[PDB]
Design an enzyme around this catalytic site. Structure first.
Site, PDB file in Angstrom:
ATOM      1  N   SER A 258       0.856  -1.210   0.000  1.00 17.56           N
ATOM      2  CA  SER A 258       0.000   0.000   0.000  1.00 17.56           C
ATOM      3  C   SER A 258       0.882   1.248   0.000  1.00 17.56           C
ATOM      4  CB  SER A 258      -0.925   0.016   1.237  1.00 17.56           C
ATOM      5  OG  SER A 258      -0.198   0.164   2.462  1.00 17.56           O
ATOM      6  N   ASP A 259       0.306   2.322  -0.543  1.00 13.93           N
ATOM      7  CA  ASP A 259       0.845   3.615  -0.164  1.00 13.93           C
ATOM      8  C   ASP A 259       0.572   3.850   1.331  1.00 13.93           C
ATOM      9  OD1 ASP A 259       2.028   6.193  -0.435  1.00 13.93           O
ATOM     10  OD2 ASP A 259       1.124   6.546  -2.319  1.00 13.93           O
TER      11      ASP A 259
END
Ligand SMILES: *[C@@H]1O[C@H](CO)[C@@H](O[C@@H]2O[C@H](CO)[C@@H](O[C@@H]3O[C@H](CO[C@H]4O[C@H](CO[C@H]5O[C@H](CO)[C@@H](O)[C@H](O)[C@@H]5O[C@H]5O[C@H](CO)[C@@H](O)[C@H](O)[C@@H]5O)[C@@H](O)[C@H](O[C@H]5O[C@H](CO)[C@@H](O)[C@H](O)[C@@H]5O[C@H]5O[C@H](CO)[C@@H](O)[C@H](O)[C@@H]5O)[C@@H]4O)[C@@H](O)[C@H](O[C@H]4O[C@H](CO)[C@@H](O)[C@H](O)[C@@H]4O[C@H]4O[C@H](CO)[C@@H](O)[C@H](O)[C@@H]4O)[C@@H]3O)[C@H](O)[C@H]2NC(C)=O)[C@H](O)[C@H]1NC(C)=O
Ligand SMILES: *[C@@H]1O[C@H](CO)[C@@H](O[C@@H]2O[C@H](CO)[C@@H](O[C@@H]3O[C@H](CO[C@H]4O[C@H](CO)[C@@H](O)[C@H](O)[C@@H]4O)[C@@H](O)[C@H](O[C@H]4O[C@H](CO)[C@@H](O)[C@H](O)[C@@H]4O[C@H]4O[C@H](CO)[C@@H](O)[C@H](O)[C@@H]4O[C@H]4O[C@H](CO)[C@@H](O)[C@H](O)[C@@H]4O)[C@@H]3O)[C@H](O)[C@H]2NC(C)=O)[C@H](O)[C@H]1NC(C)=O
Ligand SMILES: *[C@@H]1O[C@H](CO)[C@@H](O[C@@H]2O[C@H](CO)[C@@H](O[C@@H]3O[C@H](CO[C@H]4O[C@H](CO[C@H]5O[C@H](CO)[C@@H](O)[C@H](O)[C@@H]5O[C@H]5O[C@H](CO)[C@@H](O)[C@H](O)[C@@H]5O)[C@@H](O)[C@H](O)[C@@H]4O)[C@@H](O)[C@H](O[C@H]4O[C@H](CO)[C@@H](O)[C@H](O)[C@@H]4O)[C@@H]3O)[C@H](O)[C@H]2NC(C)=O)[C@H](O)[C@H]1NC(C)=O
Ligand SMILES: *[C@@H]1O[C@H](CO)[C@@H](O[C@@H]2O[C@H](CO)[C@@H](O[C@@H]3O[C@H](CO[C@H]4O[C@H](CO)[C@@H](O)[C@H](O)[C@@H]4O)[C@@H](O)[C@H](O[C@H]4O[C@H](CO)[C@@H](O)[C@H](O)[C@@H]4O[C@H]4O[C@H](CO)[C@@H](O)[C@H](O)[C@@H]4O)[C@@H]3O)[C@H](O)[C@H]2NC(C)=O)[C@H](O)[C@H]1NC(C)=O
Ligand SMILES: *[C@@H]1O[C@H](CO)[C@@H](O)[C@H](O)[C@H]1NC(C)=O
Ligand SMILES: *[C@@H]1O[C@H](CO)[C@@H](O)[C@H](O)[C@H]1NC(C)=O
Lengths: 834, 832
Positions: A258-259
């Protein structure tokens, strides 16, 4: 509202292509792991708990160290004695696959030597839908062919140097406004969910996904999914972009992280194709995680199948082995969070042993040479009326503009580069690195003139126009420096909230140019910027004799530029975007106000593939400087175009495997002798009570209804028509046509040419021309060479949404070769091929 | 109020000493001149009417081009493609007669090549009565011996290169406040006449006059008289300072010009010893002159004797021929008033032929080398706790302070340098030159670190203390830069009207230093400034490991400094003034408020000779860094003192040269177009009163002409005069003194041995400098330094005798490395 259709199950890795060996090693080690060890690989240990901006706990029993993941795409972030490379956009401007690879190798060596396992870059998302988007400069170009190739070369350079690259941000994160809910609230906007990019299937295939296919095919180990939604499903749980496009169609065998703050659910993200949660917690230092303990629970209670968690672990270890990280492994030998030599081991809560946290390792080697060369080779000469190169005999040299001078707070004196003071050599946000020093244009140019016993001064206050005009009247040449900055949306400089509010020069730059050009008949403008700016007020002034765009050059900026200005380097760069007469000419407006009440703002990409030069060409607009334009101190001729026709896969997957065994909940309860560090994220359960150990207010609530159909199907799956290889079905890379043309240096100085091959695929809603091939060729005066390239089946196809496949349409195709998107003297029809 | 007694008549030149040949030539040419031609040599043509800041109209019939007079004492002012040399105070810090000479030569060559005949410098007035005086940095040192020698050497360098030098400002212009009525009025003060320096006769002879005696004796061609009054008689018509002290006692053979706007009468000033009016008008562009037409009329009507104007002309021509200007003559090839190639020939009224006014001649040669070397050799290492020289291997270098960086308006972006922005390399006012470029310390030090692949940054906002402290914590060495500026009184920067309001570092400098030293254990401070500053808040901080004062280094500033920091140059400079713990320790306060109603403010120099170290020593104060202090990267030993005793009464009558005719011979020539505001020597008509336009013409004239003022008879030679710079017996060598100096360290470099005497007596300073030299020694090498004491060096001025006497009090000699480190001492033998 736009809707994102489901695609399940999440494809499992299969050792595809060059991943055979790494996959076998990964399966062999994951088959030894307990469920809690597997979970540790997939979840970061919390914001600022360890050394790296993302870091997992690793698997100590099997001597696998925690993975240290570190920004940025242009140099190590938040560290010391590292280099600061030019931005991705400058790499685009070189048009030079070799320099792209060498900058990737030099960065990978530095990241490796700091004990970093995964570099968070390079970037091809945002691709660059809007010229004012705040992060386009981190990536390459709004053209997918140019971007994909240099993106791939950058990846190969980093991974050949033994560090996993992370292709980001996947996908459609084309603007900063409304990208995160708490960020938007900080700026006074109330939205319940982040901006939704809504885009049709043919445009995502032909534009935004394309460089990602090249990244996958080049062997990228990791992908980072994005903050925005796509058709109202968050990028880090979008089963269509993650399971269908990236994993089933592009055949990606590595892992998806994920960011930071982009993770929004445990079960839903795991089933929709997420493999790693960064920085591991739900919000920074919340001491909670969607995964960690929750993911261990989701396997134990039957909701996430063991094969999915085993597949996350296999993709993460396979990427780590694929680049050979196990052979270079050392713990990170610096801290992102302090520069002190000693400190508490776990920074945020100030806990753990007190010990050395920085070793001040100088990893720079002689990487200033490739930085200096890449700055010079990315300086685009937009205009030159026989004014450059300078000779060194100019009697009095005026260096004008804040952008020539030093940042009075020091080169690193704005956190995350969050100001535009002094020369602009690095834009802002997490896509940044600390400069080891910054050579300014003032320093390098004044030094040059002094070596020739000339007279020279710098005026760096752009409202000191009385002094500017008096000096310009006395000067033999006035070099005028102007900039326009942008960056990631959590920083706002002068009200520009990551995105640019306009494309106008900052700090009075148009007025500074006019003050100089009004008084000096040899005024040369140098622009440092994150993207195009408006030059219409002055570019055709009769005393503006030359204009260069030098991008964001990193630490050797003044030297890169002096090499070009004084002729030690003949500029060969070409603009990687369009320079329009107005902002309206580019279309593609950002979404800047709430348009969906207090729900997610909606961002419809209604232009389809028509961004940057494709849009200008469709609207019959004339750029001031077109995509592919750059001048040289020599001239080149193109002649002799020829075309030659050339003579140029499983249908199902295996069932989803499991590796190793899962036991009782009591096997996963916190170990009795372990001190739990405040805010640190662990994989363990407080007790065998699953509901109580989850602390999830929705634990066991309507579970079946929230598990999409197909999401737990471990049976063999169909291979998609456009799938079954790496970056797409291998037949897309068959070479169908060979193209050759003679390029000659017709001038008096050695120089590089950047021949460019465009195709016209035909049809009523296709762009008139689209780039497909290029190279950068060094030629001595009068020297000729035959430039030969090939068009693959993918190069001649369009995405057909009814077939779900690439198709070569029946419209007649043509090839065009020349020096820019608007200077194409050679054209040939193409024969029917399939 | 103090009173300035008369001394008349004004002495006429007599071909004294080295002037014999130049004087004969001057008498031969002036004897051919008409009276209006002689007057043209004496009177400037009006503010901004021609090219140079001062310019006379010359004598075209006899092929004598107008004389072009240009500032400044550190490089050509208001010009282009010239160099910007270190200020005079940096020459004082070198303690180096040879560098003083070579900087004089390099300046003379540039001024010569622009067609400039007279350089308005060097300066030894102000001498430096007060540490906050706005122009002390233009001169040398508050010590008369040190200043007098380097002043003379500078003169010799200029004049050997074919330019007349102008010893200025004569005399006692020791502060800017109240120096001109109209400036005072702009600063909100109402005074009827300018500040009066009131000084007793022994103090003037032993301190302020002494460097002008050296300048006279060195052959200086011109003197510029000052804007202040001395005992309530203006400097440019003070018969006691001009006629008695300068012309009769020091024997001066050249010409005295006014400072600009310091001319205050026509007859009065001509009879009290003035020879040249600059810029020639009464106020700038008034189209009136105290001289010009008025002086031609004053000779025609009998009030000023022809012998007086003839002597003006002879003095002016003789100085011109003494330096050989006639063999180098060309019209000035630039304009002070515009940088444009073409313009009207007469700038202020935009009249005359439209033609080329600038030739852009690049006169710099290789003079950047002497400037870089003189900057390095004037950088005083005040403190060094084994921190310098740097090696280049320091891993991270923090350059901190606005004074390290660029002036964001460009190096010349403040007119007359009238701001303190970026690195201070030149203070402000008319004592300035346009830089051809300016190498900042940021540029040179960052270049040096990058040569060694180090890390380095510059922070140049002195209120960005967050960033300072952060970076200082990460740095191997922090080089902090601080300044304090001052300048001529017509410009005010931050309410400092020329003079400094205090001696504290500007731009937050104390707080900058403490922010760095609190965070970095190797913090080195570099000060650029016009004079001493207060360092007591931080100089003994345990993390301040070295301190340098680099003065005002001119165009090569950063390179001069990096050569010292990085050990290419071993510093040999010594402080030419005292660094006190407080402003009070220096005494000698400026006069900052009106103290005589709306009359001239009165400035009594009641300390007498007790300025700078003589005042510290008399009060038994301890300086932080004493006069003569400076460290080196080696050590020296002084030993072996040995002392050995060694083995006209009337002038001619005043001559006249050539003839004076009827008024009608001097009326404006009929075909001449009179340029607006231009000052001419001619009369509108044979009516003298109407042609003068003077409201006082012909009224009470004799009661306004002092007794003796027209006496051309032979005159007595004063007991203390009769030579050049005084009676020649003053320069008899009476005692020889020798010592052995050895370099006992490991680095070649220079020692500055210093010989002080103690003349004895209840009123005399404990020690006063008399001799010095700068001696280069390699490691372990030794040399014998031998010098002599003259009769002047062992004398005091006796007001009853009007002469220098060696008093009966026993005298001692002291030799060592500073005014407070004098390990060698002995009684002197009685001599007379
Ligand atoms: C074993 O242990 C496991 C680990 O502990 C236990 O796991 C827990 O299981 C729970 C269920 O038992 C989970 O809770 C439920 O989560 C869902 C999913 O929420 C996330 O996804 C939302 C989008 O969902 C779509 O897409 C995802 C993939 O991206 C799919 O997985 C979904 O099935 C769904 O798919 C459809 O849509 C896509 C297209 O989008 C299609 O392609 C598909 O075909 C399907 O059509 C997303 O919107 C959610 O976002 C919310 O939460 C974020 C923070 O988490 C926040 O940032 C967002 O802003 C948003 O906040 C709003 O909503 C939340 C609650 O969800 C509020 O707290 C908040 O205040 C805001 O209002 C999220 O990212 C979630 O949808 C469920 O909630 C709906 O249903 C409950 C009742 O069942 C209602 O009370 C809720 O309001 C909510 O209702 C909406 O939806 C209803 C239809 O679903 C509709 O009827 C309503 O009108 C309403 O609008 C649950 O919250 C829990 O997440 C999980 N925990 C962990 C740690 O993983 C497991 O239970 C245990 N097993 C057993 C057997 O015990
Ligand atoms: C004190 O110092 C001051 C400052 O230095 C001295 O003042 C200067 O004195 C100069 C004389 O030495 C005087 O020079 C005049 O300049 C005039 C303008 O010259 C410029 O413009 C012209 C015309 O376009 C250009 O040609 C020239 O190159 C310059 O650019 C000249 O016009 C004057 O030339 C006349 O006189 C000279 C001799 O001085 C002759 O050689 C020349 O041929 C000219 O002669 C004509 O005019 C004179 C004037 O009487 C007549 O005598 C002669 O017979 C000729 O007459 C014909 O022409 C005139 C008009 O052209 C016509 O009416 C007539 O009927 C005939 O046909 C000369 O060169 C400077 O201007 C002056 N500076 C200033 C600011 O005032 C001052 O002398 C010094 N005083 C002392 C006592 O030393
Ligand atoms: C001896 O003689 C000398 C010479 O004449 C006398 O010196 C003068 O002393 C004055 C009295 O002290 C000085 O005037 C003071 O000047 C202060 C500094 O002003 C400058 O800097 C500030 C601060 O700049 C930071 O902030 C700016 C934005 O806020 C920012 O742009 C800038 O870049 C700096 O950034 C850093 O700091 C911020 C956090 O603050 C960070 O966010 C950023 O990251 C960086 O870290 C600036 O605002 C200002 O415009 C100027 O540029 C002023 O602060 C003082 O004004 C204050 O105090 C006043 C009372 O005196 C009061 O009116 C006012 O409200 C403030 O409280 C004040 O003007 C003067 O500059 C000196 N002159 C010289 C030539 O040095 C000396 O006084 C004499 N001494 C004696 C004993 O007589
Ligand atoms: C998921 O990923 C996480 C993050 O990486 C990982 O958590 C870490 O697990 C490791 C391996 O278990 C934990 O390691 C412990 O470290 C502590 C503290 O060590 C430092 O400080 C001490 C004290 O000053 C130093 O002596 C030492 O050199 C380190 O600097 C150690 O004390 C632990 O080892 C000893 O005690 C352990 C307690 O945790 C004992 O259980 C262990 O067997 C050792 O015994 C010795 O010391 C005892 C206590 O003093 C004593 O009683 C014994 O008799 C004997 O003398 C251990 O090495 C580390 O702390 C965890 N990190 C955090 C942040 O919690 C997870 O393991 C991983 N999960 C999975 C399933 O893979
Ligand atoms: C687990 O136990 C810890 C320590 O008692 C407690 O702080 C935490 O809140 C508990 N976690 C859950 C989900 O209840
Ligand atoms: C001399 O004559 C000029 C021109 O006529 C006149 O302007 C000026 O005032 C007169 N000078 C005096 C002192 O009268």
């Amino acid at each position: 509202l736009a809707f994102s259709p489901p695609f399940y199950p999440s494809p499992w890795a299969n050792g595809q292509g060059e991943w055979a060996e790494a996959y076998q090693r990964a399966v062999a080690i994951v088959s030894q792991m307990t469920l809690d060890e597997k979970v540790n690989l997939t979840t970061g240990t919390g914001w600022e708990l360890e050394k790296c901006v993302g870091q997992t706990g690793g698997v100590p029993r099997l001597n696998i160290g925690g993975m240290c993941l570190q920004d940025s795409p242009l140099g190590i972030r938040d560290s010391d004695y590292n280099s600061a490379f030019p931005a991705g956009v400058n790499v685009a401007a070189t048009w030079d696959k070799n320099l792209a690879y060498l900058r990737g190798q030099a960065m990978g060596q530095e990241f490796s030597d700091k004990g970093i396992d995964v570099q968070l870059g390079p970037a091809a998302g945002p691709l660059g839908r809007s010229p004012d988007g705040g992060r386009n400069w981190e990536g390459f170009s709004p053209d997918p062919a140019l971007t994909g190739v240099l993106f791939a070369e950058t990846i190969k350079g980093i991974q050949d140097a033994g560090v996993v690259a992370t292709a980001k941000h996947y996908i459609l994160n084309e603007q900063e406004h409304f990208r995160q809910v708490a960020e938007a609230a900080g700026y006074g906007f109330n939205i319940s969910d982040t901006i939704s990019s809504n885009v049709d299937d043919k445009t995502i295939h032909e534009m935004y996904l394309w460089p990602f296919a090249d990244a996958v095919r080049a062997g990228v180990g990791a992908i980072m999914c994005s903050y925005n939604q796509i058709n109202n499903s968050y990028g880090c749980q979008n089963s269509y972009t993650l399971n269908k496009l990236l994993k089933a169609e592009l055949g990606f065998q590595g892992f998806v992280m994920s960011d930071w703050g982009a993770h929004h659910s445990g079960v839903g993200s795991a089933l929709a194709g997420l493999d790693m949660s960064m920085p591991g917690d739900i919000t920074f230092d919340s001491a909670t995680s969607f995964w960690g303990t929750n993911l261990t629970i989701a396997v134990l209670n039957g909701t996430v199948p063991q094969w999915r968690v085993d597949d996350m672990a296999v993709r993460i270890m396979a990427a780590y082995y694929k680049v050979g990280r196990d052979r270079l492994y050392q713990p990170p030998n610096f801290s992102s969070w302090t520069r002190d030599e000693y400190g508490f081991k776990y920074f945020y809560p100030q806990e753990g042993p007190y010990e050395k946290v920085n070793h001040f390792v100088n990893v720079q080697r002689n990487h200033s040479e490739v930085i200096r060369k890449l700055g010079a080779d990315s300086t685009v000469l937009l205009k030159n009326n026989n004014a450059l190169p300078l000779t060194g005999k100019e009697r009095k040299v005026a260096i004008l503009g804040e952008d020539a001078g030093s940042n009075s707070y020091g080169a690193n004196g704005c956190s995350d580069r969050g100001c535009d003071n002094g020369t602009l050599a690095m834009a802002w946000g997490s896509g940044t690195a600390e400069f080891p020093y910054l050579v300014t244009p003032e320093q390098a140019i004044q030094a040059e003139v002094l070596k020739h016993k000339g007279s020279v001064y710098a005026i760096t206050d752009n409202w000191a126009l009385s002094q500017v005009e008096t000096l310009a009247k006395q000067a033999s040449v006035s070099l005028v420096f102007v900039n326009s900055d942008a960056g990631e949306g959590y920083i706002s400089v002068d009200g520009n909230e990551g995105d640019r509010n306009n494309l106008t020069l900052w700090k009075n730059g148009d007025n500074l140019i006019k003050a100089a050009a009004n008084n000096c008949n040899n005024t040369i403008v140098v622009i440092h910027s994150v993207g195009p700016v408006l030059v219409d007020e002055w570019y055709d002034h009769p005393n503006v004799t030359a204009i260069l765009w030098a991008g964001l050059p990193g630490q050797e900026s003044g030297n890169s530029l002096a090499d070009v200005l004084y002729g030690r380097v003949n500029p060969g760069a070409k603009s990687p975007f369009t320079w329009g007469k107005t902002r309206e000419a580019y279309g593609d407006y950002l979404v800047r106000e709430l348009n969906n009440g207090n729900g997610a703002p909606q961002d419809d990409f209604s232009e389809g593939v028509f961004i940057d030069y494709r849009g200008f060409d469709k609207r019959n607009e004339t750029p001031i400087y077109e995509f592919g334009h750059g001048l040289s101190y020599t001239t080149f001729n193109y002649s002799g175009l020829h075309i030659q026709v050339l003579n140029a896969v499983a249908t199902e997957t295996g069932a989803a495997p499991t590796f190793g065994q899962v036991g009782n909940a009591s096997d996963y309860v916190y170990p009795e002798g372990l001190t739990r560090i405040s805010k640190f994220i662990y994989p363990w359960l407080n007790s065998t009570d699953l509901k109580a150990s989850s602390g999830d207010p929705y634990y066991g609530v309507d579970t079946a209804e929230h598990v999409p159909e197909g999401a737990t199907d471990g049976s063999p799956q169909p291979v998609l028509p456009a799938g079954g290889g790496s970056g797409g079905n291998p037949r897309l890379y068959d070479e169908l046509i060979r193209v050759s043309v003679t390029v000659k240096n017709t001038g008096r100085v050695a120089g590089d040419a950047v021949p460019q091959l465009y195709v016209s695929l035909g049809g009523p809603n296709e762009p008139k021309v689209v780039l497909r091939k290029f190279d950068r060729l060094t030629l001595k005066p009068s020297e000729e060479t035959v430039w030969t390239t090939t068009l693959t089946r993918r190069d001649l196809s369009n995405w057909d949404v009814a077939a779900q496949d690439w198709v070569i349409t029946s419209y007649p195709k043509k090839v065009h070769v020349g020096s820019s998107s608007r200077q194409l003297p050679l054209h040939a029809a193409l024969p029917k091929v399939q």
